[model samples]
Target: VETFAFQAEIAQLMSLIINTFYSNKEIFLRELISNSSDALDKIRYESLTDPSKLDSGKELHINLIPNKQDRTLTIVDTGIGMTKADLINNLGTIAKSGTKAFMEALQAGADISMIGQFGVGFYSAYLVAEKVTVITKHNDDEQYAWESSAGGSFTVRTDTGEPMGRGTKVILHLKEDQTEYLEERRIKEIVKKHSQFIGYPITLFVE
Candidate 1:
């Protein structure tokens, strides 16, 4: 078993990030879908080097399902899924200080706009979800499920059934105060705003 830890300051900063920066909670879908597009891009690049690595027959896409009765929103993507260790390192730890590093580089005379970064996108889900669940199946590893309440601790376990086809699914348990985010029209708008430029189809189920 592998375990991961975050720097002491990460907790405090993450709280502030969740509370302050995501005033528009709908952005969660956008950030997530954007991240998915990047994941597909990565796999596509890898396929160029090793053609056999590409498995999914369909073109990359994002799908959103909103259940008002359950106050849940699910975002699905056909992209590279994370391994168990990836769940810890990518979702659990603040491995790279992309934002901070970008700022520091800018202060040291680097062009801020030229520095591409990530690592903070997943935290955007906390804007609307009191709790979040991730079900992922990697091509090279066992399927894994990870859950977090965004209060610092997360749990990981092996998936119960046959693994999902290679990809990721994120389920958001919407906060009572943020139920608006579970509305179909609202989710559609968010997707259009943040992911219209994505090189993949985006779908939303309204009923």
Candidate 2:
């Protein structure tokens, strides 16, 4: 396993999202689905010139599994997955200076659109999940799981099971206060509002 810590300022910024930065928690669904669509777009664009990239398997879509038994929500996508390094570098850094930067922008009337451009949407997961697990397989790297519980560091390790091919899977362990996210009706409502226009169909899988 490998571990890395978020920059101190970035750390502060993330907790802010869980606290006051987010006005609507349901926005998390849209943010996550959008990220999945962007990943699919990148791989499809690359497949165009290469051809073989999609030869073996080409269908792309996103899947959401809400497991009541475990009280966790998992979102899976058949898109360009993340490598160990990308998980640490990209996922670890959500914004420039984290919390302080966010406040300055909010005070100066920060543009909401910039939040998407800066890859800040993923942090919205923390709003509902006490812990997060990401299992992904990049075409060039082995399948691995990256996990964190909003702590000082995150761990990335190889998967012992079958490879997930080219995709990313996110499992959110919902906090007691945020249990409503696992309900089918609640999830459907959130998707209807935030992700209805997405390129790929977002289906809710319950177990």
Candidate 3:
């Protein structure tokens, strides 16, 4: 249950992703989907080199589950999930002063095209969510849950829940105002609008 504070640049980056990208908040889903796709690609590539990299007959895909009763939107990927060190290092810091460069772009106002370049695209979760929880299990490491509200810090704990063979699950606890994401139609449209060209199958569980 140890908690770690985000690096200085990461805190600032979170603010920029929320405030500056507010108008284009829908891109949050796009970014998340793209990340999941990237994870799948990683495993796919690795498994090609070392066939054991994949579970015997494990299918790779992405799943979207919108839970209205819980007010949560979950994005699941059957891919190269992350280890504890990956979660800590990747989510905790930005390259030295990368946030400064992004802030400079933010001031310019016209160059809003920097979404995916700086590796801060994951922060877009704060635009529509009060909290983000990442549950991931890497082949080489045990599963872990990373939770944060972007309140300057986050926590990582070993997961003892029902075993997840391999993959990452990102659960976004939606803000009250952002609950529209809970609608199946709306989520499907976002997926269609942004990720229609993705090679992997993206399934949205509908009631």
Candidate 4:
């Protein structure tokens, strides 16, 4: 397993987020679904030029699996996955000091709706989960899992399981205080509110 520390700005922004950045934690779901849709778009566009990009037989969709038994919520997307470098660069740093902008917005008490713009939507996972595990496979790279608990560092390691065809899966070990996210009804409501109009199908695996 390889480990890396969070970028300085990322560490500060994480502290801010957990403290006073987002009042409505349900926004975390919306932010993640938005990231999934963008990933789907990338693969869709890539497949148009190179048909092999979609040869994995995985349809373009988002699947949410909430395991009540383990108190884990997993979101799977059959989109363009990331390489190991992509995982570190994307998750480890915001866009060239976007943290400064976030902090400025916070001080001004602005709407502060820049999750997508700054590529920090992924970090919203920390709001509901104590530990986040990301297993992804890219067409050009081997499958790997990126794990972090917001402890100022993250680890990335090769996955030993069956290769994920081509996409990303995020498993959230929900915090005890955030178990409300494990309920199907609550999940459905959040999707209806924020993701009802996304192009791809966002499905919840129901028992």
**Model 4: per-residue lDDT, tens digit, 89-176?**
7854444466667667767765445655655677777777889999999899999998988868888899998787989999999989
Rank order (by TM-score, best first): 4, 3, 2, 1
Report clash pairs, candidate 2. Answer: 13-99
For model 2, the stretches where C-alpha displacement exceeds 4 angstroms are: 21-23, 92-101, 109-114
Q: Which residue pairs come into collision in candidate 4?
A: none
What lDDT, from 0 to 1, does candidate 4 have? Answer: 0.83
Estimate every model's Cα lDDT from 0 to 1: 0.70, 0.77, 0.83, 0.83
Residue pairs of candidate 1 with colliding backbone atoms: none
**RMSD in angstroms, candidate 3?**
1.9
Q: For every model shown, what is its TM-score relative to the native structure?
A: 0.81, 0.88, 0.93, 0.93
Question: How many residue pairs clash (N, CA or C atoms closer than 3 angstroms) in each of the candidate models, in the order given?
Answer: 0, 1, 0, 0
Output the worst ten-in-a-row residue range by lDDT, candidate 3. 91-100
Off by over 4 Å in 1: 1-6, 92-96, 99-118
Clashes of 4: 0
Between candidates 2 and 3, the lDDT winner: 3
7 Cα displacement, candidate 2 (Å): 1.1
